[PDB]
Amino acid sequence: EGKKTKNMFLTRALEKILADKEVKKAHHSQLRKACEVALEEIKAETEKQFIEADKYFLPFELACQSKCPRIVSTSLDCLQKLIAYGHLTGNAPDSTTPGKKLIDRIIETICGCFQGPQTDEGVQLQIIKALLTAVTSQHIEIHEGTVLQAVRTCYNIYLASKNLINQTTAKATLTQMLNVIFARMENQALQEAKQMEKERHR
Amino acid sequence: EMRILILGLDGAGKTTILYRLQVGEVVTTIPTIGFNVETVTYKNLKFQVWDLGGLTSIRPYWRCYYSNTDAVIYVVDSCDRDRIGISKSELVAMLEEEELRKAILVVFANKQDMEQAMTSSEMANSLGLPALKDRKWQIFKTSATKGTGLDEAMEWLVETLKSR
Numbered sequence: 001e002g003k004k005t006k007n008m009f010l011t012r013a014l015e016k017i018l019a020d021k022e023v024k025k026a027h028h029s030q031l032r033k034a035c036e037v038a039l040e041e042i043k044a045e046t047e048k049q050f051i052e053a054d055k056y057f058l059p060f061e062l063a064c065q066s067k068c069p070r071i072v073s074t075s076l077d078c079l080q081k082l083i084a085y086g087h088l089t090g091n092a093p094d095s096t097t098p099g100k101k102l103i104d105r106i107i108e109t110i111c112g113c114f115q116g117p118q119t120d121e122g123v124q125l126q127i128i129k130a131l132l133t134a135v136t137s138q139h140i141e142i143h144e145g146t147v148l149q150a151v152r153t154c155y156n157i158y159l160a161s162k163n164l165i166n167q168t169t170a171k172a173t174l175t176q177m178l179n180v181i182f183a184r185m186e187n188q189a190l191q192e193a194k195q196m197e198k199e200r201h202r
Numbered sequence: 203e204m205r206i207l208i209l210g211l212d213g214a215g216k217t218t219i220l221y222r223l224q225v226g227e228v229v230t231t232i233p234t235i236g237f238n239v240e241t242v243t244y245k246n247l248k249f250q251v252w253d254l255g256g257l258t259s260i261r262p263y264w265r266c267y268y269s270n271t272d273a274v275i276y277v278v279d280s281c282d283r284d285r286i287g288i289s290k291s292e293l294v295a296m297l298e299e300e301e302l303r304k305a306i307l308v309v310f311a312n313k314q315d316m317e318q319a320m321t322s323s324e325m326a327n328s329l330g331l332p333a334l335k336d337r338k339w340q341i342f343k344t345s346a347t348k349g350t351g352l353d354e355a356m357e358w359l360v361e362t363l364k365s366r
């Protein structure tokens with residue numbers, strides 16, 4: 001089953017960004033441009049004919065860097081839906097980056113939306129959700145430095161947050177994230193051992 | 203302002219219901235792993251609605267989110283005859299939890315749009331809803347793929363929250 005849903009998320013999120021007030025300003029002009037350019041391509045390719053999300057990360061990274069919680073939340077929610085549905089894999093390494101890939105840069109952008117207690121509470125929540133999804137996603141391979149970063153960010157939110165709902169979520173998210181990571185490590189060890197037993201038989 | 207959880211076994215239609223309530227569309231979904239959370243507005247109380255995964259391995263995490271929960275929407279596959287005993291088992295477990303003592307229960311017999319579906323009564327039985335006390339609750343036939351049931355169930359729920 002091949003899906004329209006990827007596209008709806010990408011386009012509707014971009015539209016919501018472009019539709020927001022504070023993005024009209026020249027102060028968010030780069031963001032405005034990025035979103036219009038991305039849209040100009042996704043629309044142009046959707047009437048023709050797969051749409052590859054990896055190429056369109058720039059508007060979301062920029063939205064995340066905005067000084068408007070509204071823009072940031074919208075960006076974070078879209079990224080979580082993108083990663084979750086497996087449209088945003090991020091398996092291409094930038095230049096200085098390796099041994100790291102696009103995905104590590106995406107998780108890092110997510111983590112950087114948290115600036116301490118003063119961070120908007122809805123953006124906090126959005127950060128917890130997206131990290132949980134990222135870290136528990138079976139599609140993507142995440143560098144362990146990026147894993148530890150994800151982990152540290154959730155725990156920081158848990159300490160610093162004034163919002164009890166957010167604290168508890170952070171708490172629950174950490175436990176699940178950790179349990180998943182460890183389950184996954186143990187299973188990888190298992191597969192490696194099995195291959196090795198198989199090779200052992202020349 | 204009001205905290206709502208959507209719970210139930212995997213495949214039941216929790217996530218589809220979620221986005222059918224938020225933007226009135228049938229979204230294509232994946233098995234939920236990490237929670238979903240959305241702001242929903244039925245005229246006119248503000249809702250924070252949480253959607254957790256119903257896979258076996260995720261269910262123990264449900265209670266981590268019972269804190270301060272105002273109401274629970276519990277979603278059951280009306281065609282899952284094999285597993286309705288498990289929905290009961292889980293529904294029983296969660297309503298034994300002290301953090302949910304004053305939460306409103308709403309059951310969605312989902313996938314009613316299909317012919318193989320069980321009835322409201324048969325399902326309310328198999329989930330042991332009559333033996334519930336002191337619990338405020340009601341069961342509702344629904345299809346999330348179509349529109350049937352959602353508006354009646356939400357209206358009930360909304361009134362019941364006000365009333366309390």
Ligand SMILES: Nc1nc2c(ncn2[C@@H]2O[C@H](COP(=O)(O)OP(=O)(O)OP(=O)(O)O)[C@@H](O)[C@H]2O)c(=O)[nH]1
Nearest residue numbers: 212213214215216217218231234256313345346347
């Ligand atoms: N026929 C019919 N199918 C439905 C209905 N609601 C959901 N489905 C389908 O059942 C499957 C499960 O939908 P989801 O909403 O993802 O189920 P879920 O409750 O979130 O399951 P988990 O995320 O694994 O916990 C999907 O393929 C839906 O298309 C319904 O009302 N009628």
Ligand SMILES: [Cl-]
Nearest residue numbers: 076077080130
């Ligand atoms: Cl998010």
Ligand SMILES: [Cl-]
Nearest residue numbers: 114115116156
């Ligand atoms: Cl920090």
Ligand SMILES: [Cl-]
Nearest residue numbers: 118119120121
């Ligand atoms: Cl705030």
Ligand SMILES: [Cl-]
Nearest residue numbers: 175176178179
């Ligand atoms: Cl753990």
Ligand SMILES: [Cl-]
Nearest residue numbers: 195196199200
């Ligand atoms: Cl070898």
Ligand SMILES: [Cl-]
Nearest residue numbers: 171172175266
């Ligand atoms: Cl605990």
Ligand SMILES: [Cl-]
Nearest residue numbers: 304305337338
């Ligand atoms: Cl009650």
Ligand SMILES: [Mg+2]
Nearest residue numbers: 213214279282
């Ligand atoms: Mg089922």
Ligand SMILES: [Mg+2]
Nearest residue numbers: 217232233234
């Ligand atoms: Mg789901």
Ligand SMILES: [Mg+2]
Nearest residue numbers: 216217234254
């Ligand atoms: Mg779900």
Ligand SMILES: [Mg+2]
Nearest residue numbers: 243244247248
């Ligand atoms: Mg409302």
Ligand code: NA
Nearest residue numbers: 014015018039
């Ligand atoms: Na437009």
Ligand code: NA
Nearest residue numbers: 035036039040
């Ligand atoms: Na445009």
Ligand code: NA
Nearest residue numbers: 045049050051
């Ligand atoms: Na193409």
Ligand code: NA
Nearest residue numbers: 073074075077
């Ligand atoms: Na949002």
